[PDB]
Amino acid sequence: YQSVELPETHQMLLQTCRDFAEKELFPIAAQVDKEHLFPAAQVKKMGGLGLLAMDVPEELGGAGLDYLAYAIAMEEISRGCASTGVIMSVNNSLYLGPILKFGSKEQKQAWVTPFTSGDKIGCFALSEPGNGSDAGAASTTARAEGDSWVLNGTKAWITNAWEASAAVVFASTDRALQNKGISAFLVPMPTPGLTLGKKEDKLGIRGSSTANLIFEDCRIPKDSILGEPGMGFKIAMQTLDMGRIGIASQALGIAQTALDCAVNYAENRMAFGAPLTKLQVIQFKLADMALALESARLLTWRAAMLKDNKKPFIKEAAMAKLAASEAATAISHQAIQILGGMGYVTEMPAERHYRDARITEIYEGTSEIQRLVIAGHLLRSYR
Amino acid sequence: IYQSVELPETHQMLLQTCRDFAEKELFPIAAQVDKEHLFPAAQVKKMGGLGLLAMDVPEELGGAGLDYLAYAIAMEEISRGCASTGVIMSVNNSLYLGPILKFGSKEQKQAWVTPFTSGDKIGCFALSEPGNGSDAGAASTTARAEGDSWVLNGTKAWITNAWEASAAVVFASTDRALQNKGISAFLVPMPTPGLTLGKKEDKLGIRGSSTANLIFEDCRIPKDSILGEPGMGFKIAMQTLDMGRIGIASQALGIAQTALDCAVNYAENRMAFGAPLTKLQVIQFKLADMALALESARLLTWRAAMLKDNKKPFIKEAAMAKLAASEAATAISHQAIQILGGMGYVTEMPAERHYRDARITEIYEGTSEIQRLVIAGHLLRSYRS
Amino acid sequence: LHTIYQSVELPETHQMLLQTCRDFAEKELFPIAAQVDKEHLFPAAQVKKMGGLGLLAMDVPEELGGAGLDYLAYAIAMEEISRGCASTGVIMSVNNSLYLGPILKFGSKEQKQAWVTPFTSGDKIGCFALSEPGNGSDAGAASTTARAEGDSWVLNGTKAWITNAWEASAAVVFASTDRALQNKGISAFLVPMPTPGLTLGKKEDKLGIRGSSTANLIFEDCRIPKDSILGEPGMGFKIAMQTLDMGRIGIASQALGIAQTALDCAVNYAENRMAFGAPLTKLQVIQFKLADMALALESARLLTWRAAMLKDNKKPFIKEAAMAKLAASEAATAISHQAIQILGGMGYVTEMPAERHYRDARITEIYEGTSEIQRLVIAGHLLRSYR
Amino acid sequence: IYQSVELPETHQMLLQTCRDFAEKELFPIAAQVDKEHLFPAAQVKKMGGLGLLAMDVPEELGGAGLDYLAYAIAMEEISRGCASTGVIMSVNNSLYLGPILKFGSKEQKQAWVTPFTSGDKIGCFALSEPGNGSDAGAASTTARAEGDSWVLNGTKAWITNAWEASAAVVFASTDRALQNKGISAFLVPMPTPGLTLGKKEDKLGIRGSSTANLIFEDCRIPKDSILGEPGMGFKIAMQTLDMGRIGIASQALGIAQTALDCAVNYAENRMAFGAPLTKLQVIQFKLADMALALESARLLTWRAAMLKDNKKPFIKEAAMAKLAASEAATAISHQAIQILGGMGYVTEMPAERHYRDARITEIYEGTSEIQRLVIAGHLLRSYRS
Ligand SMILES: Cc1cc2nc3c(=O)[nH]c(=O)nc-3n(C[C@H](O)[C@H](O)[C@H](O)COP(=O)(O)OP(=O)(O)OC[C@H]3O[C@@H](n4cnc5c(N)ncnc54)[C@H](O)[C@@H]3O)c2cc1C
Ligand SMILES: Cc1cc2nc3c(=O)[nH]c(=O)nc-3n(C[C@H](O)[C@H](O)[C@H](O)COP(=O)(O)OP(=O)(O)OC[C@H]3O[C@@H](n4cnc5c(N)ncnc54)[C@H](O)[C@@H]3O)c2cc1C
Ligand SMILES: Cc1cc2nc3c(=O)[nH]c(=O)nc-3n(C[C@H](O)[C@H](O)[C@H](O)COP(=O)(O)OP(=O)(O)OC[C@H]3O[C@@H](n4cnc5c(N)ncnc54)[C@H](O)[C@@H]3O)c2cc1C
Ligand SMILES: Cc1cc2nc3c(=O)[nH]c(=O)nc-3n(C[C@H](O)[C@H](O)[C@H](O)COP(=O)(O)OP(=O)(O)OC[C@H]3O[C@@H](n4cnc5c(N)ncnc54)[C@H](O)[C@@H]3O)c2cc1C
Ligand SMILES: OC[C@H]1O[C@@H](c2ccc(Cl)c(Cc3ccc(O[C@H]4CCOC4)cc3)c2)[C@H](O)[C@@H](O)[C@@H]1O
């Protein structure tokens, strides 16, 4: 259930991840951001704990957990480091997720199992320079020739691009079929015909890598296709439905640690004779931050539990992602404000939380796309 | 319409029963109840027969033996039908029966609970006074012991069901020098010598409910009319409001849900620039924000109910739910008017009523500002723990 | 005319006009506002007194019986009057901007003498019939028609939502003279009330501005003289739009009055209500609400005065009038909502005026183009500016 | 662009001169200034030669002989180009020269204003301390009289231009018993014996300005370094802040404008779903809301500037301008990032920088919370008149 008693596997998992975060991520979070340093040693240890492959079956090397467990772990990890959070989220939902749900027995053996322990991680390449929200406009092409698919085109904004050893790539096998002409492919990295673009210099989550995947006469075997030709758009969308629960959970952790920072500070900063928490406006700020965060967690857990129970969860996932991301930006903004001048400098982690929060309103579907998704499903329920 | 969580089949069936009752008995009368300020007597009687006026009361006392999750679901479905009918039911459940269940004697429960579980008699809750609402502990109505009697003097203000209730849980200071350790709770019959009703308030909304002062002038009641012991009245009132706030949260969910229902149905059939309003992206975004606000507040509300059912602390969670639901009901009913356009402003559509009805949920059983104080205090305590 | 500095200190004539309308509102309007609302009573005697003061024809030349003032003066007066009574404000705003406005701007000298002059003294007022039951936000979709027949036009169709419908003696009516031309096939017509062919619909029962009448005008083969057309055929769409640009300044000013009187009520109440041992104004949350109310009100007024002065200075003001109407209308609802909240229980009942101010404010977000329409207007003109 | 009712020809030409300077000298360096946290010395010197560092300063003292309306327009156009350059400029104008001009002697103006009007030397303003920024009056840095000199002890905090300034206006307590009324203001050369600079702060934004503590240890200055009489320090600080808040409001206007500039050009040239972004209703509504927030905040700002120019009271008005402009800058820069999508999160575009620069305007020269307190105080005092 929801806060109303968690199962004890999930409660133990919560404490496990919270212990890992505070011991292994809190002391490195500031350096990862300032040095834009990929946290390889921390990622490997998380692999050992099963956090990089949580809903993956144990026979494939995964933890055998569920998406409520994933959501809890994503929050605790992201509370400690937002970049570490997104690295983990991409491996779980966006890379392993579609291969589990749509892959061959042999594709799972070759592409899931070597990516469950933290020695290798994957990435997800849907967006392109000309189109992100308009995912169905993918114009990277895949052409069948001989025993190969031949890939040509640029994918953009690919998280883990510089550290991953495989990608789920969406390319159009016939642009005239529009979002029925997209297919999904498993692409090893590195590979001939594939070049990495320059790393993006980002506002936040600076410990993750983000770079273009440039395909030029890139040949991969025919059986690299995930599913059948034309399934790619559905594969991408059902993958993002799961991924959005991950990003919602990341935002929950950014929000929680920004709120932790503000409460501790306000309890010890003195003004006009008393701690800041004696001022009414400060109490109201804290109350509204706690309300935004706790209700967005309820939405997140609802989406996660619907998925686990094999129920439709597209609208609920979108709601959780929208609510958590906007709450993470509003809470991190008010945490800066509560710190005052100290909110604006590196002596405190509030300015970093604000920068990290801002991305959760953009990737895996902007807040605008989330609102469209919610409207679409709301109206169908009334029909 | 929401697809949320794992409902027990008992509560799934209760939702359908209540929704069917509301659509069949409440929807046709909501406009008349509001426009004519008409207490919906026949429907309250019928709800009483169903167990809706005494949901959390044990069956051996005449109640339905349900839980507070069931109460929240019923309150939403009923208030969706009629916002006045909702509050009337919520007062009887949380604010009148609730404290007597939790603090009464055996003799008090069989005398003051059981006859108020079927819809032939309802009660009310009298804490606020003209000089003080939010500052509840400033109650200056007095109760003085004399002979075999308590003697009550003073005016309670804003009492919902004042003109239809047959009993009241009244809070009065047995010694004002003790401040909010000087309040006591009393069971008072209505009517009774020494008690006069003030004129009914002319309200913005919830027009079906009566609201009026209770004016005590040398009003004598039996010595054993006291609920609890002298001086625990303040805590009786606060623990009662903690439970009532889940009711008002659920009332706000109903208003919000029926305002959204109204907006969707209208936007699907109103044509503009060649097509239904639901083809306009701006209208889609309004509806999505309304659905999110509503479904968010319901999860908060259900959490507080389920927490109380599991005997866990729930003061902070009850206040969050009441706060979120009430501000959502005002926001959603505002945007439902807006989606209807000119028709949103006229009495032959229900949207302007929902907006008037919503507004009260931000005020009573503790204003939004009090809820934020309550939330902040408990949040801070949790961090010091 | 109008220096930039006059937005910061009014010309003495405008400062005098403010005090004069405020005195009038508090003496004549404050005592009756609640009655006008609860009884849905057209305030005929007060509109007459305002007509004698020039407030019903502020922009009208003195030569034609008007006050000979400008739109800055009109906005100041609309605020003070609406602070007294929101209904009286709208009634005054329709006559100034929506009825007289288009006739001064697009009429011949003959038409002004016949249709402006008898409507400048408060004995007759006008109205503006653009909306129809099937279309309020797209003016251009007028299905009411006007067909030429000899020395007459013949009007057929139902206009909807007409403020002053049950009290006006003339209407500016928009009708399609060429359906095929859509947007360029609309024309504007001066119509007498009563007149054969015209039936009034039932009055609408509304949330607020209850003192004003709102009803359909039903035209069934209704004939009017040929020179009733305002401008030339096809100009109706431009006339409606340019009229609504002026009218939006009037509605912004009405919203300012509703907001100001709601804020007046909240300050007086919070200063004299105690809680937890001190006035409400000692509570930090209350101070913040009041400050937020004042900011929203004062910036919306600066937007409104800007639009008025631009119009007075013969500059474009479509975007600026839309910003003013949008800002002031949303400020009126937010401020009136927070005034209720500051009053607590008293904010929900008729003992106090706060709940009425909430209901009155709600209309300003809808009429003369909803807030959504205002944002579309603002966006279109912002993009034109960058091009 | 926006509209204004006729600006004087003076100010129209100033706007164009300042916009030309910003687009030619500041736009090409803005990214480097931010990324390398590099003080824009050559540009500041050029601005000094134009009069921009001493705008409301009499020409006979080396200034431009302009007014605060002109200052607000120049602040906006400069900050539209570089938010760091804007604050460096705003500190010299309002925070350093302002109080010397308003409270200084003929001789103090000659020695402390004139050498700081041409960009060769700039000043700074030291009121905050590590333990108190909002609580102004709680200044624990002391200044004791020692015959014909003053001796200062204590640490001032968060001083912008600290590492580039040749003089500070420093506030220190000359009578700690007198609290609010025992503060004084002092003109301090930089560098000077007894003064040490803290390490530069590493900041979210305006990274081209320097920010550091000023540490006074037995720092001796002549007797006529005091501005005004002993005890006038708190008033000098508050009236200086009233002026500076118009400067920060204008800085925020320029950050807001350049963010909206970037979003409009981007949305007009980015396609999605077969059409430009500006064909989407939600994008149109964002842009309209950004435009409205910016233009109304500028009107509030110009009102405060003109009142000051006309020597009318302007405390509430400056606080409203600063509050509205600063919250607008954050909201507008936020929505600019959103309109750009992925491009809003990276240095390929300048939106992420604008987001970071805007954030400081809600904090310094009085947080939004303090601004609301100032507004509330003067509203109530006006009502009590
Ligand atoms: C740090 C980072 C990491 C990323 N990692 C990945 C990754 O691993 N894999 C991957 O596939 N992608 C990734 N992306 C891409 C990301 O998902 C996109 O940025 C986003 O989904 C699409 O936005 P866009 O950048 O193309 O902007 P655009 O799609 O051009 O959107 C521009 C604006 O239009 C708005 N808009 C409003 N209404 C509509 C409407 N009806 N239709 C369309 N747009 C509308 C959008 O909300 C946005 O404000 C990443 C992006 C970032 C910034
Ligand atoms: C329709 C209706 C029915 C009602 N029914 C009942 C009933 O059946 N039983 C009953 O007992 N009561 C009832 N009430 C009373 C109701 O609960 C009060 O109206 C409410 O608690 C607030 O009290 P007040 O009216 O005294 O406002 P005030 O307490 O005077 O409050 C005024 C303003 O100050 C604010 N404020 C107060 N204290 C603080 C603080 N410490 N910090 C910050 N802000 C503060 C408030 O939030 C509010 O905005 C009813 C009220 C209404 C309107
Ligand atoms: C009290 C009152 C008095 C009135 N008085 C007058 C009068 O004197 N004269 C007169 O001519 N009219 C009058 N009206 C009509 C009024 O101007 C219209 O109500 C209003 O403009 C909206 O039209 P509508 O009611 O048809 O709503 P609709 O146009 O149906 O709009 C419904 C919803 O869709 C939105 N919408 C519509 N078009 C678009 C679009 N393109 N993009 C996005 N959203 C859109 C709207 O904003 C609204 O939320 C009055 C109305 C009222 C309530
Ligand atoms: C980049 C930068 C440059 C600066 N430059 C200068 C400079 O040149 N000169 C200078 O003198 N200072 C300067 N400052 C200091 C700046 O003005 C202060 O940081 C600011 O006024 C807030 O004070 P504080 O940092 O001590 O925060 P605090 O006062 O500790 O504020 C903490 C929080 O409590 C709130 N709060 C405080 N008091 C109250 C109250 N009474 N009621 C309600 N809420 C309250 C605040 O609004 C804030 O949210 C600078 C700061 C920064 C970040
Ligand atoms: O990410 C997805 C997009 O990114 C695009 C992109 C767009 C404009 C520019 Cl100008 C650039 C150059 C650059 C500059 C600076 C860089 O590194 C440091 C140095 C200083 O600060 C940062 C790296 C790259 C790249 C790709 O071209 C596009 O196809 C993708 O849609």
Side-chain angles (χ1 to χ4, degrees), chain A residues 269 272 281 337-338 341, chain C residues 284, chain D residues 125 127-128 133-134 158 160 367 369:
Chain A
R269 175 62 165 186
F272 304 87
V281 58
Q337 199 66 15
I338 280 154
Chain C
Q284 197 166 59
Chain D
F125 179 89
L127 171 68
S128 311
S134 310
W158 308 109
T160 168
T367 62
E369 292 67 43

Side-chain angles (χ1 to χ4, degrees), chain A residues 129 134 157 200-201 203-204 269 272 285 333 336-337 341 344-347 354-355 358-359 361 368, chain D residues 35 130 135 158 201-202 204-205 270 273 286 334 338 342 345-348 355-356 359-360 362 369:
Chain A
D134 191 4
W157 313 107
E200 302 281 351
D201 186 5
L203 175 58
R269 175 62 165 186
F272 304 87
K285 281 147 133 49
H333 181 277
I336 284 177
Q337 199 66 15
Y344 204 66
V345 297
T346 54
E347 288 96 304
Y354 191 54
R355 291 187 282 104
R358 184 65 189 82
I359 192 42
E361 294 175 273
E368 292 71 44
Chain D
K35 185 110 193 294
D135 187 0
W158 308 109
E201 300 289 350
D202 188 13
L204 174 62
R270 170 68 157 189
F273 295 94
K286 283 175 197 301
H334 182 277
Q338 197 70 12
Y345 203 72
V346 297
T347 52
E348 278 91 316
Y355 192 48
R356 294 188 280 106
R359 186 55 186 91
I360 196 46
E362 300 173 85
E369 292 67 43

Side-chain angles (χ1 to χ4, degrees), chain A residues 128-130 154-158 198-201 210-212, chain D residues 35 270 343 346-349:
Chain A
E128 312 185 326
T154 294
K155 311 307 292 192
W157 313 107
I158 303 317
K198 245 203 84 167
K199 288 178 167 182
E200 302 281 351
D201 186 5
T210 324
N212 290 0
Chain D
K35 185 110 193 294
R270 170 68 157 189
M343 279 298 165
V346 297
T347 52
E348 278 91 316
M349 293 291 270

